[PDB]
């Protein structure tokens, strides 16, 4: 869609890359999000330095910690 | 959960064990008892972990949302 | 049914542990708090790593620095 | 009042207080006024860093956003 | 007139985004909101002048943004 | 007035003040204006350091969010 | 000056060179073109400096007010 949050909806049910502050990263399937960018991923993995360090299954990430969001696979 | 209501995932986790990761990496594991829209929450039979291990048994604890990075129903 | 701030009401006049950002900790009796979690402890003690480093008497702690509150 | 922590401050108006700040600086002085954000004014204030007085400020306005806690100060020994 | 209008005139232009902590992105500005959240197309994340990652479309939260620049040519 | 600390600022208009910021940066100058966020303007501002000017700035607008304290002196 | 409108000091600086000091040793210099109540502002012919030396030529740039410590006037070339 148009504005950033409206567009983010196009990613629902798709794999995404969530880059967090502190140079942490999560990958998983986007299932929900609000206008604060709080969001839920399914089948999520936390990566660090490039390696998967934890399997977080379903996870709710607080938007305040997010740096950027991009398409994964 | 509703595509526009991410906090419903907390509702779906009431009474289930959860993992809470905070800024600065402190982590807490406990049974989720309640929460609010700021993601403040109350856990029972809670434990605090540091560097991959349990460092403190807290019992019931209210955790302020503003310091939370994520909440996981884990595996 | 009790959201956090409401649940906190049950600790009123009872001893609590307050952990702050930067690892400082306070112990005392919860006398009051508001919605921002600003709160007052009576007979408060400031602990660092293990023992008391300061006896405060009645202290008002700003909620913004709080990481967690427990019994 | 269990819903009014700021009443604690009210009881301290015109008495010596200790204001502990983020970064661990500390101010001591007489509380003259404060608002709901905990911005406040002290008269006869001293600024302490690493244990000692580093400055005498006279009257000072401290922004609440930097405060960690406030307690009562002691009278001279 | 207002800063937000300059963003509006940058739609479809290449931009340089510098974040707090110094992460940098360069890409084509596609959209933005009043909080300065932005979407860039054909983005590259850079560290010290070298592309660290090719992102394709990316949504950058405005709260971490230090500046958004239209840069210089060549 | 025990409910309006900002009045202490009101009382310092057109008088020299010392401004202490997060990070320990210090400024001195004549207070000319301020708002409820404590954003303020100083004329003849000088950045100071351990009681020693290190930069003469002229008129300056300081963002309130970085202020630790303001004293009349 | 309007004792209650400190942002007017910016109004007076529109189309003039300014110095934008950020959260530690970093500053930008450029000609102020616009600003809002959050202190977000736009500069033209701008530069980013570190340690007093030009690090990057920023052209027209929007700087977010949340990172600004202070704003003062810049100078014309010697």
Q: What is the CATH number of the domain that holds F12?
A: 2.30.30.100
Give contacts of B7 with chain C, Cβ < 8 Å. none
For an interface test with G, the pick among F28, F36, F37, F63 (most G C-beta atoms closer than 10 Å) comes out as: F63
Q: Which of G8, G23, G72 sits opposite F60 (nearest CB)?
A: G72
Tell me the shortest Cα–Cα distance from G57 to chain F, in angstroms. 23
Residue G22 CA: distances (Å) to CA of A12, A46, B12? 37, 33, 43
Q: CA angle, C66 as apex, C63 and C70 as ends, to 5°?
A: 110
- Chain E positions with Cβ closer than 8 Å to G: 1-7, 16, 20, 36, 62-63, 65-72
Q: Which of D21, D35, D57 sits opposite F5 (nearest CB)?
A: D35
CA F47 to chain CA centroid, Å, is: 11
Touching chains, B (3+ CB pairs < 8 A): A, C
Give contacts of C21 with chain B, Cβ < 8 Å. 24, 67
Nearest-by-CA chain E residue for G59: E71
Q: How many domains does chain D have?
A: 1
| E strand or H helix at E3 | helix E3-8
Q: What is the span of the domain harbouring residue A39?
A: 1-73
Does B68 sit within 8 Å of A56, measured CB to CB? Answer: no
Does C60 sit within 8 Å of D9, measured CB to CB? Answer: yes
Tell me the shortest Cα–Cα distance from D14 to chain C, in angstroms. 16
Method for this entry: X-ray
Does G72 sit within 8 Å of F57, measured CB to CB? Answer: yes
Please name the residues in contact with G26: beta carbons below 8 A apart, sequence gap of 6 or more: G48, G49, G50
H-type alpha helices, chain D:
6-12
Does A67 sit within 8 Å of E60, measured CB to CB? Answer: yes
Q: Do chains C and D touch (3 or more CB pairs under 8 A)?
A: yes
Q: Which two tokens stand for residue C40?
A: 């007052």
Q: H/E/C letters for each residue in chain F?
A: CCCCCCHHHHCCCCCEEEEEECCCCEEEEEEEEECCCCCEEEEEEEEECCCCEEEEEEEEEECHHHEEEEEEC
Contacts of D71-77 spanning 24+ positions with Cβ under 8 A:
D71/C44, D71/C56, D71/C57, D71/C58, D71/C59, D71/C60, D71/D17, D71/D18, D71/D20, D72/C57, D72/C58, D72/D12, D72/D15, D72/D16, D72/D17, D72/D18, D73/D15, D73/D16, D73/D17, D73/D18, D73/D28, D73/D29, D74/D16, D75/D16
Tell me the shortest Cα–Cα distance from E15 to chain G, in angstroms. 9
């Amino acid at each position: 869609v148009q504005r950033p949050l409206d567009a983010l909806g196009n990613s629902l049910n798709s794999p995404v890359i969530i880059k967090l502050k502190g140079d942490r990263e999560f990958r998983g399937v986007l299932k929900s999000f609000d206008l604060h960018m709080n969001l839920v991923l399914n089948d999520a993995e936390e990566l660090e330095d490039g390696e998967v360090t934890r399997r977080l299954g379903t996870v709710l990430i607080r938007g305040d910690n997010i740096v950027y969001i991009s398409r994964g696979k």
